[PDB]
Symmetry: C5
Subunit: 311 residues, 5 copies
Amino acid sequence: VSPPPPIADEPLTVNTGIYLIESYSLDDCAETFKVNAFLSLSWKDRRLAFDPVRSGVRVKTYEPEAIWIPEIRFVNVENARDADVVDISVSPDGTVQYLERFSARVLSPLDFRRYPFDSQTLHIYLIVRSVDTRNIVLAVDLEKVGKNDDVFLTGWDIESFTAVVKPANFALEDRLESKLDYQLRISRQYFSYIPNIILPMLFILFISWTAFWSTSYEANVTLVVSTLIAHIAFNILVETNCPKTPYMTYTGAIIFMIYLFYFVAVIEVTVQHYLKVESQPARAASITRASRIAFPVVFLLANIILAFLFF
Amino acid sequence: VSPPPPIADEPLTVNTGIYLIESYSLDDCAETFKVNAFLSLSWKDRRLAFDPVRSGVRVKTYEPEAIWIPEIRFVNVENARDADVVDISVSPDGTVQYLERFSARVLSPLDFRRYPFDSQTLHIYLIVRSVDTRNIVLAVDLEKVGKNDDVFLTGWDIESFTAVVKPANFALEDRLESKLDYQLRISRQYFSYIPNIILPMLFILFISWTAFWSTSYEANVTLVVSTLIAHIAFNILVETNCPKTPYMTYTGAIIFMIYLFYFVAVIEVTVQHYLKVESQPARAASITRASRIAFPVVFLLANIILAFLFF
Amino acid sequence: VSPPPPIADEPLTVNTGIYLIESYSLDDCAETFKVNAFLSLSWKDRRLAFDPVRSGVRVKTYEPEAIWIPEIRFVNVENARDADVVDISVSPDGTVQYLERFSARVLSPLDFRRYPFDSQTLHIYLIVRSVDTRNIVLAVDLEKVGKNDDVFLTGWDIESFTAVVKPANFALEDRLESKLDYQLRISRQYFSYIPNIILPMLFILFISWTAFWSTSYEANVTLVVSTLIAHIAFNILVETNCPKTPYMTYTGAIIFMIYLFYFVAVIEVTVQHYLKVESQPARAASITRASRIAFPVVFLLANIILAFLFF
Amino acid sequence: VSPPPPIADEPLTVNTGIYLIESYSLDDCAETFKVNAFLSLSWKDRRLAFDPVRSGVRVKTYEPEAIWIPEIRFVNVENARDADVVDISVSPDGTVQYLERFSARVLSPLDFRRYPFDSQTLHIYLIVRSVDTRNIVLAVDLEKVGKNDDVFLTGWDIESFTAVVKPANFALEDRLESKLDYQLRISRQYFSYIPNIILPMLFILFISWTAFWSTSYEANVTLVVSTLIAHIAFNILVETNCPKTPYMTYTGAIIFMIYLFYFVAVIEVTVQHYLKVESQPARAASITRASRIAFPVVFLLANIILAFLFF
Amino acid sequence: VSPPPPIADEPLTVNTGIYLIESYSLDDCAETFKVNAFLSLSWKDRRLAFDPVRSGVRVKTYEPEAIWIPEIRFVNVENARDADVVDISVSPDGTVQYLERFSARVLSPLDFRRYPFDSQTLHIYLIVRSVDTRNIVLAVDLEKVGKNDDVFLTGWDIESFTAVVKPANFALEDRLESKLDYQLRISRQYFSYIPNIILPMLFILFISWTAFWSTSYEANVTLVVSTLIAHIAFNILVETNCPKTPYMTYTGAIIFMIYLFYFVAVIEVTVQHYLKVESQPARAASITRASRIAFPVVFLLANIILAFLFF
Ligand SMILES: [Cl-]
Ligand SMILES: [Cl-]
Ligand SMILES: [Cl-]
Ligand SMILES: [Cl-]
Ligand SMILES: [Cl-]
């Protein structure tokens, strides 16, 4: 067996579809997700055409080995998918209806710049390589592209599963390659982030700010430095567990600013005490009183600037 | 190696049964569980019916490749189950009795809203795809559904193993499919949750409340802030290792409240000292005295409200 | 390729023997252990008997596929064992000397109530399902049950590897199952626990007791609260990495008591200071002096009670 | 299924080419990287020569089992690559053009001395063992060497993918081996390191330097020791998760210096207080005043020396 | 498919050789190491012996399935090695020369008593089980035992790869077994340990010793207790990453001593303050002055004793 012959000079159309059965193991660190789905394939092989009358059958079932089947591969997979041919059906005209169940660990880049208010498009790229006898081209039947209602990823809302209908046909190592883009659109469930991370982090910072209503240098040193320890401790607790991102994220910028604020509050506490000790209590008291407003105001403003820059 | 022919036009009934041998590795982070069980299958194939007189034997044993066997798959699995056919028996009327031992990692969503007082229903979905010549329908043989008495999951109580007898018949990829729901009901047993996590966490909070029987601002700052560090430290220690849940859990709400209480106690400590320093000792002393009752009372009340809202 | 026929009505005896080559990966969290061993099987199939004179051979070697071999499975395994048939020998009377090398991850419950002074019995359950034509029964020859001298599990003393000679014969899914219990007895190597965990944990607690020889409330608050932070920090450092146990362990009770002691010492420190401040230095001094004896005595007593209750 | 015969005594040339489809999972700890690529192979096997006229076809397609294929292995792999033969094309002269898609976990040493400003050369070593009947030699078909434009490694810039055209031919276990070196050049994306690691670590160090504008020994002990705790805490937070490198890294030297600086600042704080207490306030005040300049200057100077020594 | 016949009554000698291609993944927690190597096997089979003059070939090449090959297994492996037969050559006298490339995860116990100044001997145990017709014995072909020059293990110096030429012949499961010991000798690269672990741990302890030049009980409590927190924190940072070792290690003893020293320094600080407060300043001042010398001296002496006892 070799590819079906062209009637004219036309390429062979392999109609595809992917139906998600299970989506699992989305890994933010590895930028990978595990999928379990159906892969449907449809094409015409006139060599396989038959007279249903003089055959006594309206359909013919074949073993994968018995007939020509296109070699469809996935571009962005760790290793080749584990596939199980579910069914192969041939109709009197030579139409082949192929179906397999497969599992695969798909590599898809994730953008964490807007985390935890991010949305992602997961990609699954189907590909076919042409042979010398004839060019093979992929097509999508969107009726055949879907997902089980029960499919889920914890912490994400799965908006849709679709395919970009126009394939990407290009030459590679002297042969045409036809590629399809299947997209899984997901948006993060950011609720518990406010009470679980942000609010507690904010409270610690706010505690450090009470040093602006105290003249006790010993109590102030304990306030700013102990809260810095509590902040670091809290970040270890709520730690992403992923190796640090190469780029600056939204949450990343806020956290950097919180460290800057702890340093600035230490400078203030240091300045106020030095001024007091160096017989200048009027300047010390005026700085501390300004800080009471300057600190929350500069914080709230910089946060609005960051929110604006990222979104 | 073709499906058994219908006597009329009826679909083929495949009577199923699952008998749990072992259940293990329930992973809370992954929402998966590993199972080891028997899968029994029974259907009628009249091409296999025989006369026990001119054969001699009351039962016939076949190799899987000698006869037609329905392809049963699991819907919610990572990869296909590891199976080993244990036995294939045919009775004189053509009734096939198939048995295999399998192991599988089943994906089943878990609800942590009532943790650690939560109960879960683990699902195992059997499925069969119909074939060209005839439709295949699943059924439950309750005589063949059960679990070994020694079956266990650490930290859980296994209430029951049962199946929803009526299958879910629907259409997939242009063919009819019959699905079954096997349910494993488990409820969390965490006897040690109180002593192990709760109490030490309450003691730390209670220590912060001793600041209401002290006028020393330096000692008060050390009490509230050092206990906040101890609280965060304790939460790192008793951390589940599972990424934070997208939703608000019961234990999650209690912990959020504990952070709020540390912030409120800091505000009090700050207010009391400012009033004392700003020549108002009457208002400072009256706030601190109120707090001694207000703090435990508001805590005990909010906890009753939370327990009521979640349960 | 059918079971050997009976001479009367007696069941077929499959003589077993397990010889441990390697024991590894004992996971306390998973309650699982990986084993690599020999499995010996012995039975008589008269259909295989031969005249050594006619044959010109005193022994006959077969491929597993060529003859009837009982289907032996393990009850408490994650998946079916990976096996390599090492040898199949048939003597003139039809005796089969089967030998295979296998690896398997065995699930065996572990009791942590007496940790780290615990001993465990690891189980390996062999099983055979009886067929249509005849009943199959397992037997042990203890001469054939052993372990390599080099077998080891880090942190454990392996006392013995044996089998309970009497099989457990029972009905399951309308057939007989003959089950064998192979036991691996192990006892933990608790030495480094004293200098690594116990001793530093006691020193931290002892430091909090120095607050009973101090009147300085600021120094006392620093002693009790900072040591509580050090205790929690130390617990994070020496943490088992296994999720907390559903039941109350011995070490678990001691740790709970240590948290209770930190809370009680805070109460004392708080009471002392309040009485001292509120014009009652006679009570404050008498409480602190009592605590100096009360604390070590109540600790040493409760510990004896706990050691008695657990052992 | 024996190697093609030589026309004279010439070795067989196997022309190779690797085209990267996906690159992923670079593991810094393991010094390994996962790759998914095409492996093209070409050689002349005259036994496969045909007349395009008698055959009809200008090219012949074969199954891997039908013809002799050289055994190409990778030297630096964990296990053998997972390969899937995409195409085998034979031209009339008997020139075979083989193409396979493979995935492999390649072991390649990484130098972390200049981290996070490091560049690495990842190696993939192709190898072929010569046979009894003839010597096999590898060659590079540069037309068939490349990488997909979309190839990415999070946190790295992929500079180039190339092959050292001259093979390394040597004797091993009495036969010739022909080895090829494919190189993937990558350079790290160090941006977020400044705001995420460097800057917050410098702020904690700077806070410790405020002890040089304070005479309060109690406040100074709190400053230096509490910041040391915050530093250690921060290091736990930003920890690589890879076991410590056997060699001294650039970042490793900076961190060692920061610990030295915390110790020196403690010595100063200790010296200043002892001089004050031992009736020498002139010496104490002159040391503290010097330290205010000495500390940032010696730090900035040692950092320039380190940056010079490493780069 | 039968073993070669003996010329007299001699056992069959299988000459072995292992050539290391790659060594990777040495895991200290798991006490395992992954190896990729060649395994050469040589034995004489006269049934395969041929006259070269009437045969006309240098060496005959066979497929594994075609001829008898001894079953060589590894004793200390997780699962059976993944092997790929590279070549099978037969010379006129019947000498079979077998070669395979294999990968295996070898289990080899490690002694951490002298860590990080330890050396280890990694073992690879080859084994062969004798057959019905003849006894099989292993031997070492020293020409075929080696390692690639590029073989590496990060953090270790690979000293040698040798084999103990005399096999260990013994009886197992009623048959003779010939065992060979291949040894990989490695010594640890302990450099970065001094600046990364030892030095910062000694600085934290040294800071605690400044309490001997202070009379301030509040500052002393902060020094000793806060440094104990910093020590524990540092230990979490530099943590072994392996579950605790059952035996007392060298580094383990030093760390235990450091905890003892923190407790002793607390006792001193407590004693000095009590003596001062209980009208005995002569006794207090003399203890603190003694401690200034007693502490570093007792430390340096106990360390010399430990280094002597372990080495
Ligand atoms: Cl694929
Ligand atoms: Cl399945
Ligand atoms: Cl098994
Ligand atoms: Cl390879
Ligand atoms: Cl092996």
